[PDB]
Amino acid sequence: IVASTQLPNTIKTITNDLRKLGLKKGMTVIVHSSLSSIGWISGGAVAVVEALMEVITEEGTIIMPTQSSDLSDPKHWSRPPVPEEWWQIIRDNVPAFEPHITPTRAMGKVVECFRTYPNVVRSNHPLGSFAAWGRHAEEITVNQSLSMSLGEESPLRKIYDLDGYILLIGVGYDSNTSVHLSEVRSGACELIKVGAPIIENGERVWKEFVDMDYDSDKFVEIGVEFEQKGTVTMGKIGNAKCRLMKQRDIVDFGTEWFRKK
Template identity: 45%
Template sequence: MSEKTDRPLILKEDIIAGLRKAGLKAGASVFAHASLSSFGFVMGGAETAIRALLEVVGPEGTLMMPAQTWKNLDPETGVHWLEPEAWWPAIRENWPAFDPAVTPSIGMGAVAEMLRTWPGSRRSSHPARSVCAAGKHAAYLTENHDLSDIFGDDSPTGRLYKLDGQVLLMGVGYDKNTSIHLAEYRADWDKPMSREWSAVYREGKRERVCYDTIAVDDSDFVALGKDWDSFAGIRPVLVGNAEIRCFDQRPFVDWSARWITEHRKKTAPGE
């Protein structure tokens, strides 16, 4: 007996059509963020999504997605909120060191994790904020990911800017849009700094490394995205239950840096 479902059936051809309608270009280098479950029932799951993405950008294109391992940060930052504080020393001494070839991404979704393991995919070496990429510019986007330059000008996100790439949001909102962090780096505001620790392998041995970076803040990303949609006339394309947005990264980052400067500018005492 068949059962009723409110989940639409999504085929690869549906995703391809939606991506092209949203504006994803052949030959593009694109930073994609995706929630597979938001679509409905995708026939073939994450594999189908990756095949659709790679087919649209084609052999001259590049697909990049987040492969972050943010639990490889000191528990004092709050990333191990489910574990008691009494365990923190053990976490510091025993959390597995980052191995680009082995360490799974955390919370990035099934599509991003599929790309991480895709044949020919490359991954940047940042122990907490890595990305993975496949295609023409994968090596350039992922090489030499500096510990302190997590989302800055010479990070994978900054290098996508130099390639005049695109941003793709598939069933996720602007709170998942990593490119806004590049705008944070570039904006004129009172940037707070953060000292972070992560476990890495050096000469085959586990070692904790310390690095300083700006403390990014995504609390206003949804408001920023709403204003960007209005400013740029973004009209999401619906595929199943998922909204797809695609736009050029460079004008978006430039606009977002101005938005952040205006909305986060330091307020003088007494104002």
Template identity: 50%
Template sequence: MDEHAAVDAVDDPVTVDRIAADLRELGVDAGDTLLVHSALSELGWVAGGPQAVVDALQRVVTESGTVVVPTHSTQYSDPSVWTSPPVPDDWIPQIRESMPPYRPAVTPTRSMGAVAECFRDYPGTRRSRHPLYSFAAWGADAEAVADDHRLENGMGEHSPLARVYERDGSVLLLGTGHGTNTSLHLAEYRAEVDAEETTAGAPVLRDGEREWVEWEDIEHDSSDFPEIGAAFERERPDAVTEGEVGAATAKLVDQPALVDFAVEWLAATR
């Protein structure tokens, strides 16, 4: 919604206090490991914008827990595979040679939303070193979640998604749905679906020097994620809590239960 619609969507400004209270009512608690997907515009008019959302998340989870946010930067992918939009063929070598290297502290996110862009360099936040599929984490287990994010199979077993799973974490869908739920990519790897393998590449810094690196991954497919999420919510209503945060519909989802369900669903369906 635009800013006029955001004002009309709420009776009062959505504040840090209100967001924090709504999160607690939803079931978010101190000490949780919380993987957050968000659409700021769905919350209504927020006093302080994305900063208010980040402050509220940190207030509720506290430093005894861990907040994790996807901070992907897919603009750093190989330009030869770009489709939205494609670039002229004669641009590709120039882009590869001139694109600045991925740097966790400064590289912006792409299509991840205002909250993720705000969170990525918040004080005390650690951002993983994957040039395409990074995650940022804050709190007690930030280092363990964000570090050792390997290039190969970037949303698989050596990614922050698997570290959230190991900690019995939850997914917070804040004004967004399962179509953007990155945890379902972890299920893609575990289900060993018949996905096409691909070679990915991006510029990174190594020993202070820019270097183009390549690695193996699978072609990710999120087209059926909304269907998986809907099936999970029907079959496991005990693992999902729905409520409102500001004007947004919010869902708190048991991440390991979702991933385990999606592994079986994908193995049977794809």
């Protein structure tokens, strides 16, 4: 990242970049990131978390998805998949989700760092959890539904209700979790029978439930079109191409988009 960078990215410079882009105090923002994309950072992930906190403050709210899809029913694993003989073994053995414990997958280093921070709170979903910090942290994360995990009873809906923002740091619309709310609303996806391990009555139980067969693959196309409207702000955090936008704007657009096929 070194060659790609003039002078170090720091907490300070990131805070600059953030405010430049339009972030400020008191804002409600869900954040999606690629650490590497920014360039060389003095402090790495910590520096990004710290800068985000410094801009937003305790008076605002930072959210990130903390997915742990590796806890899911492997019959549904299509990349990569695993031998079918492995399936029951998995169901019988994979350890239970616990918010204060279970690592994320495919979320990134900023997320992993964020998750561990003091006063960060994580929702209680074994597969599709979110973490949050600040004013509306609890409100956003509490009482996530097991079934329809990214639906109307989810952190996505809470953010919507709050007229929050989405920030993409060096990632694409396919990383844009909120658009899953669009899939839900539009009924864009088949319902599937799923499973995951949870703690019930202080013991591990493999829980069967129902959710949408979420597919972000389609989100890239959606975002392009969405961006024709011209309501997405853009700038750089270090080397990172960033986008800032209203969650409601994109979610509404998405829902509509899906309805039209």
